[PDB]
Design a protein around this ligand. Structure first.
Ligand code: CLA
Ligand code: CLA
Ligand code: CLA
Ligand code: CLA
Ligand code: CLA
Ligand SMILES: CC1=C(/C=C/C(C)=C/C=C/C(C)=C/C=C/C=C(C)/C=C/C=C(C)/C=C/C2=C(C)CCCC2(C)C)C(C)(C)CCC1
Ligand SMILES: CCCCCCCCCCCCO[C@@H]1O[C@H](CO)[C@@H](O[C@H]2O[C@H](CO)[C@@H](O)[C@H](O)[C@H]2O)[C@H](O)[C@H]1O
Ligand SMILES: CCCCCCCS[C@@H]1O[C@H](CO)[C@@H](O)[C@H](O)[C@H]1O
Lengths: 57, 123
């Protein structure tokens, strides 16, 4: 069968599933950005932009 | 105005507001210093609660900042009464005796910190 490192080649001649895989990557990336922002908001201290700005945190 | 009854007021939020006087009332109320006086009703209606921020330095100008009331229309002091003395120098001194002279109040600072206070004029 296909080796492990070629499994995604099944999409080369399947535009619909390629779009699906791209959609899922895009879902993952956007989910990352949302999750990351939530974690930051749950840890970020806004009380001192002078000596404790975002880049120190 | 059409003197309001409880049923006119109930649930409107008017019950937490102090009576007002209109623009014609720029007069002078005479004080006869042989006469004794009283305040029959004193009402205090808060419209803003500011909390002093607690800064890192020390020394800097720490400011009072705005807050959001979260405990609803439950904040006013009313039905307060007491002596109004006329002093030898012609000043007046109000001595609070009794009334609904406190309210617990919770305000919320930006970021979520809740600041409860006993808003009062006791004594
Ligand atoms: C847009 C970027 C992109 C895209 C869409 C692809 C797409 C593909 N590549 Mg290529 N490639 C890329 C970038 C890309 N490549 C980069 C940057 C490199 C250098 C690292 C490679 C090196 C490379 C090699 C050497 C090979 C491929 C192969 C393939 C094909 C099969 C992939 C497969 O089945 O993997 C299956 C993969 C797995 C089952 C597990 C991989 C686990 C990785 C190693 C660790 C975890 C990755 C992590 C989850 C990803 C985080 C995202 C990252 C950006 C931070 C497929 C057409 C193969 C090919 O040509 O087949 C004929 C092939 O042999 N690619
Ligand atoms: C954006 C990420 C992404 C997307 C959209 C796909 C999409 C696809 N993969 Mg791939 N794959 C991925 C990441 C992804 N993969 C990673 C990180 C691995 C290593 C664990 C794999 C290993 C893998 C295998 C071994 C196979 C596929 C296959 C497939 C296809 C059918 C679904 C499947 O069996 O998944 C299985 C993979 C997962 C459910 C990911 C697990 C995530 C861990 C728990 C984190 C589809 C084209 C199948 C295929 O069509 O092969 C011909 C197949 O047999 N993929
Ligand atoms: C007017 C024509 C048109 C438009 C507007 C697009 C637009 C797009 N194409 Mg392309 N494409 C077209 C014609 C078009 N294409 C044609 C004729 C072909 C040959 C068949 C393709 C083949 C093609 C492929 C193979 C792929 C794309 C992809 C993309 C998307 C990449 C960016 C993305 O995912 O953003 C992120 C998404 C958003 C911010 C959301 C956008 C909101 C969408 C547009 C609303 C969807 C509802 C709508 C009714 C469904 C039809 C959409 C379709 C017309 C794009 C983007 C939406 C890629 C993709 O879908 O990746 C996931 C992809 O893999 N295109
Ligand atoms: C420009 C930005 C960018 C680009 C070009 C890519 C491109 C890619 N992403 Mg994506 N991704 C991005 C941004 C990007 N991503 C962001 C911001 C996130 C959120 C964190 C993700 C999350 C994401 C996930 C969850 C997955 C991908 C996957 C993929 C690959 C799918 C095609 C494939 O089969 O490769 C085949 C794989 C390779 C060619 C290997 C790429 C190796 C990278 C570049 C280095 C890995 C370093 C190291 C070995 C990882 C170990 C990590 C470990 C310590 C935990 C491709 C290389 C999928 C993938 O890798 O499927 C197997 C996948 O599962 N991406
Ligand atoms: C739909 C609309 C949309 C909007 C308005 C936003 C808005 C935002 N996103 Mg999100 N996001 C979206 C969709 C969207 N996102 C989608 C679909 C994904 C999944 C891929 C993401 C994934 C995502 C991630 C991973 C992150 C963001 C982040 C953000 C923030 C900063 C954006 C930034 O710096 O872009 C920077 C954009 C780039 C500089 C654009 C570069 C474009 C290249 C150069 C184009 C090259 C190709 C082109 C064809 C070249 C020819 C062009 C021609 C004109 C000559 C911002 C609030 C950031 C954030 O704060 O997360 C909370 C962040 O980290 N978002
Ligand atoms: C369905 C739906 C929904 C929901 C959804 C959700 C809830 C989502 C989420 C999502 C999410 C929540 C996502 C997430 C994602 C994430 C990711 C994708 C991650 C990744 C990671 C990575 C990739 C990593 C890497 C690494 C490591 C691990 C270490 C170091 C190195 C590196 C960086 C490489 C709603 C309701 C809207 C409705 C409609 C439908
Ligand atoms: C659709 C997405 C689903 C939503 C779920 C995820 C939401 C993440 C949003 C994060 C923002 C809230 O972030 C959260 O805030 C409060 C307020 O300071 C913090 O709360 C912490 O401090 C306050 C005040 O000092 C304490 O009363 C509390 O016990 C303590 O846990 C949490 O520790 C933090 O993690
Ligand atoms: C989709 C996001 C939904 C969750 C939003 C949580 C409220 S928002 C949240 O409120 C906390 C308390 O005031 C703050 O300390 C914190 O900075 C702020 O991110």
């Amino acid at each position: 069968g296909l080796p492990w490192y070629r499994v995604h080649t099944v999409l080369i001649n399947d535009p619909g599933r390629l779009i699906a895989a791209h959609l899922m990557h895009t879902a993952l990336v956007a989910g990352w950005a949302g999750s990351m922002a939530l974690y930051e908001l749950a840890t970020f201290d806004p009380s001192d932009p002078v000596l404790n700005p975002m880049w120190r945190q | 105005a059409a003197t309001l009854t409880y049923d006119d007021i109930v649930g409107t939020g008017l019950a937490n507001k102090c009576p007002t006087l209109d623009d014609t009332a720029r007069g002078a109320y005479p004080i006869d210093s042989s006469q004794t006086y009283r305040i029959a009703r004193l009402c205090l209606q808060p419209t803003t609660f500011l909390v002093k921020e607690e800064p890192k330095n020390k020394r800097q100008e720490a400011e009072f900042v705005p807050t959001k009331l979260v405990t609803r229309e439950t904040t006013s002091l009313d039905q307060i009464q007491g002596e109004l003395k006329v002093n030898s120098d012609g000043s007046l001194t109000f001595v609070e005796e009794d009334g609904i002279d406190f309210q617990p109040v919770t305000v919320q600072m930006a970021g979520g910190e809740r600041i409860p206070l006993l808003f009062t004029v006791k004594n």
